[PDB]
């Protein structure tokens, strides 16, 4: 089915808070905003790759 019904871990999750998950861990150890690359990759790669 799915996994087994454990009331004692259910109340463990209620009191837990996740420091880092699988997705935030991809920010590294110090925050670097890489949003500008959205523009960069689209002027330096896509338009040069679309020459085909």
């Amino acid at each position: 089915d799915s996994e087994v019904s454990d009331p004692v871990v259910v109340e463990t999750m209620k009191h837990e808070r996740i420091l880092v998950d699988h997705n935030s861990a991809l920010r590294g150890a110090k925050p670097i905003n890489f949003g500008y690359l959205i523009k960069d990759a689209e002027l330096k790669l896509v338009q040069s790759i679309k020459g085909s």
Binding site: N23, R27, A29, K30, P31, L45, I49
Partner: protein, 913 residues
């Protein structure tokens, strides 16, 4: 000090005798004033004695007796004689209209009577000052402060205009000064008003009303309240019967119980004296709104909320239209406080609204309004009111705290939601941080009040959300340090979260110690918190006591299999150490996935497993798995998106190195889909450095090495990783920057002891040294390349790895030996060793042995095996012979030079005298 007390005796001339009859204006006055009318009409007394007896009546608590005696007097004197008598009556009724415990219609009656008599007197004499002052005071009592002040100004200009019109001047008139000082206090021009009050003090230090009162009022408004109190105390020192000075001193006592108390005992003494003085004054001034609002304060802080409400309802409301609206606002604000304390937030809202209606600048009432809005779950509305208050109170600690917490709650809630964009999240985080840090800066600027440590906890969580965990550590340690400064017990939660912040920073020993403190602060019977604390300890000791971690993991996975993190890391540790058979691993992950198939952490662990093995399950199932994660569970999941983009990049690069029409354009399309996936990840999270690294890799594989290197440098500044260092080295190699390529290759080797990646890095070190060798014809660089390649090959056959790689490094070694031979052969003998040429001949023989083992192998087509044959039978015949020619030349060279020294020997033997 001077005196303007009234004479306590009157002598009236008698008319039968010419002697005098004496009246004590203190005692002798009849209980009904008509008993003196008689005496004043037979002996035809002057009107001034009528006025004197009436003034005595009024100044001894019998103003009605006086108004009626001057009423009687109006029958006795005729037209112009009445002028003074009307002026008196005006000021009489004014003082009846000043009844504090009076009703509203009686006060309007007394003011009507005042202006009746004033219009009469001014008709008889318009320029008598008693009339003129009576006019401005009338305007004052009718709230027309602007008109009162301009009529005072017109009068003052007029009086100077009729002494510079009779040629003289005037020294200041105390009552015009006093009215202008009061009116300037009303216009909130406090400083100006202070000066006038101060001016009066030097002109008349026994003036009534006491100008020290106004001095203190303006000192208090100008934030020198300390001095304010002194002047008020001064006023009570000079006159203990002055009840308003007494009340001002009482207010000073309440304020000084807060400002002057050193500790708890002194505060209790000062507040108890303030309260007993309040009781003493109040039990003879029971309709004083100020004392009633003070009682309200006391009853609120004593928890007696019903009495707060009762005071408002049964006392203040009955007399509300005559209370000054600032005092009424204080009383309605306390009534709202009481309603709030009783959990009746509708009525506390109503009363904070009413308090704001009577004083729009009542700060505490507005804070209460916003709080009642919070209590009614009107969050955005409460934010509106708090921010409108912030527009003019940005330096208020309590307001910065409240707004910081409201916005922190909004940020945390936004984090738990799916549909919160990255800029919504960051804007919320930064707004809450702005407010909370301004709270901290303001609270620490003062040194009387302590920091609410909740602010430290919330700030450290917010900096979690900003990916600044050392700041989290710093702020939470400030919380713990403050707690222990006030000798308060440290919550298990703060120790545990402090240990987590220490873990994320690399201090596993401090984290271990704090997790053990947290667990030491727990009952043995409880197991909900004990599961998380056991996982925390095991997770912290993975790299230092891995045998303890695996035991804890086995216990948590056996007893409580639903605890996911323990399962994931138990399987990770046993897989990464080859402690689990690959069959039983491939079974364990499926039994871990097929019961928690929506757990995105488990899905990402599964994707990692599929990518990592690269044998049992490869890119087919990882493409389907990650697209299942996207199109069925999140579709914004950075992890699955990046794995998809990575597989697209691998198929793109393996399409770009072949020549097949339809199937080199599927590499142009796959680079584009990979770019699109990285771009979407950056839309969801612009701080995702792995998307940046993938884009940089695509930049480098379009031979755009500048941008690729700058992205890889910025990624390395936040990711201490095998791959980013390897990519930096790779990229330096492709820029012909052989020095930095070699530096970064040996760096990635000196950290990150990884055995499956080691031979490839040694082979690329060999490639870099080979590159720097052919571009300087240096045999030392060829030999550095040679040792690197030799150790790479020995490890390739230690691993038993792909014969692709072993053949490639065998070719590399043979090529290097041939290059060494051919570079030594083209060298000046003064730069060679005989033993270096010997070594190069034996190196060339071993190069040819590897070349013929590459030729007879029926699968090696990295060189055409027609170039390979020619170098075999160029190594076999000719090059060899060449390298012995340069060998024989070298030693003949060597011998020749032993020729040369001995000739020098005989020449410097020959040269003696």
């Amino acid at each position: 000090y001077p005196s303007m007390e009234w004479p306590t005796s009157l002598d009236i001339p008698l008319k039968a005798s010419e002697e005098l009859v004496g009246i004590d204006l203190e005692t002798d006055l009849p209980d009904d004033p008509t008993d003196l009318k008689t005496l004043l009409v037979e002996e035809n007394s002057e009107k001034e004695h009528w006025l004197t007896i009436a003034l005595a009546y009024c100044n001894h608590g019998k103003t009605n007796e006086g108004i009626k005696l001057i009423e009687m007097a109006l029958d006795v004197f005729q037209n112009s004689e009445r002028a003074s008598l009307h002026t008196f009556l005006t000021w009489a009724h004014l003082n009846l209209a000043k009844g504090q415990s009076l009703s509203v219609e009686t006060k309007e009656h007394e003011l009507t009577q005042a202006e009746l008599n004033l219009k009469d007197a001014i008709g008889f004499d318009p320029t008598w000052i008693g009339n003129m002052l009576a006019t401005v005071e009338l305007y004052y009592q009718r709230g027309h402060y602007d008109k009162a002040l301009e009529t005072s100004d017109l009068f003052v200009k007029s009086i100077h205009a009729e002494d510079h019109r009779s040629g003289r001047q005037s020294k200041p008139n105390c009552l015009f000064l006093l009215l202008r000082a009061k009116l300037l206090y009303q216009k909130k021009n406090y400083m100006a008003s202070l000066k006038i009050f101060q001016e009066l003090l030097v002109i008349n230090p026994v003036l009534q009303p006491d100008p020290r009162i106004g001095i203190g009022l303006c000192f208090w408004q100008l934030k020198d309240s300390k001095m304010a109190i002194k002047s008020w105390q001064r006023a009570l020192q000079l006159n203990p019967k002055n009840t308003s000075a007494s009340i001002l001193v009482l207010l000073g006592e309440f304020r000084e119980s807060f400002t002057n108390s050193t500790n708890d005992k002194t505060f209790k003494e000062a507040f108890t004296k303030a309260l007993s003085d309040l009781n003493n004054i109040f039990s003879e001034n029971q309709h004083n709104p100020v004392l009633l609002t003070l009682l309200q304060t006391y009853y609120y802080f004593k928890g007696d909320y019903q009495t707060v409400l009762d005071i408002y309802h049964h006392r203040i409301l009955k007399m509300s239209p005559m209370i000054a609206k600032i005092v009424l606002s204080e009383s309605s604000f306390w009534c709202g406080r009481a309603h709030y304390a009783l959990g009746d937030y509708r009525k506390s809202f109503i009363m904070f609204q009413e308090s704001l209606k009577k004083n729009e600048d009542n700060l505490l009432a507005k804070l209460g309004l916003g709080q009642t809005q919070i209590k009614n779950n009107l969050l955005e509305e409460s934010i509106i009111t708090f921010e409108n208050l912030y527009k003019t109170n940005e330096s208020l600690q309590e307001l910065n705290y409240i707004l910081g917490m409201l916005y922190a709650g909004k940020a945390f809630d936004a984090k738990t939601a799916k549909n919160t964009s990255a800029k919504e999240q960051s804007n919320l985080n930064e707004k809450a941080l702005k407010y909370l840090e301004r709270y901290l800066k303001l609270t620490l600027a003062t040194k009387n009040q302590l920091v609410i440590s909740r602010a430290y906890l919330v700030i450290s969580q917010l900096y979690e959300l900003q990916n600044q965990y050392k700041t989290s550590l710093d702020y939470l340690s400030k919380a713990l340090e403050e707690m222990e400064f006030i000798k308060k017990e440290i919550p298990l939660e703060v120790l545990n979260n402090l240990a987590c912040y220490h873990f994320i920073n690399g201090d596993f020993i401090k984290a271990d110690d704090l997790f053990k403190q947290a667990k030491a602060k727990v009952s043995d019977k409880d197991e909900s918190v004990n599961i998380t604390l056991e996982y925390n300890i095991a997770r912290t000791n993975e790299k230092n006591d891995c045998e303890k971690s695996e035991s804890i993991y086995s216990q948590v996975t056996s007893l409580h299999p639903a605890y996911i993190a323990a399962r994931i890391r138990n399987l990770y540790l046993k897989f990464a150490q080859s402690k689990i058979e690959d069959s039983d691993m491939s079974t364990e992950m499926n039994k871990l996935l097929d019961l928690n198939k929506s757990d995105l952490e488990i899905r990402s662990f599964y994707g990692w497993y599929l990518k990592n093995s690269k044998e049992r399950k490869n890119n087919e199932k990882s493409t389907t798995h990650n697209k299942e994660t996207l199109v069925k569970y999140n579709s914004h999941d950075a992890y699955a998106l990046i794995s998809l983009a990575n597989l697209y990049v691998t198929i793109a690069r393996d399409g770009k190195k072949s020549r097949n029409p339809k199937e080199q354009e599927k590499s142009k399309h796959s680079y584009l889909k990979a770019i699109q996936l990285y771009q979407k990840v950056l839309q969801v999270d612009p701080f995702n450095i792995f998307a940046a690294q993938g884009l940089a890799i695509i930049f480098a594989e379009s031979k755009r090495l500048g941008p690729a290197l700058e992205i890889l440098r910025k990624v390395r500044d936040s990711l201490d990783n095998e791959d980013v260092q390897l990519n930096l080295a790779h990229c330096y190699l492709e820029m012909r920057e052989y020095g930095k390529a070699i530096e970064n290759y040996e760096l990635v080797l000196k950290k990150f002891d990884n055995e499956k990646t080691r031979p490839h890095i040694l082979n690329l070190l060999g490639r870099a040294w080979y590159a720097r060798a052919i571009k300087e014809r240096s045999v030392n660089f060829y030999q550095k390349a040679l040792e690197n390649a030799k150790t790479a090959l020995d490890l390739f056959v230690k691993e038993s790895s792909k014969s692709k790689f072993i053949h490639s490094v065998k070719f590399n070694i043979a090529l290097l030996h041939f290059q060494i031979a051919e570079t030594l052969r083209r060298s000046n003998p003064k730069f060679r060793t005989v033993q270096q040429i010997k070594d190069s001949l034996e190196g060339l023989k071993e190069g040819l042995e590897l070349f013929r083992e590459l030729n007879d192998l029926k699968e090696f087509n990295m060189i055409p095996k027609e170039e390979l044959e020619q170098r075999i039978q160029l190594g076999e015949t000719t090059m060899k012979s060449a390298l012995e020619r340069s060998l024989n030349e070298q030693e003949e060279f060597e011998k020749e030079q032993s020729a040369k020294i001995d000739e020098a020997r005989k020449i410097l033997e020959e040269n003696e005298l």
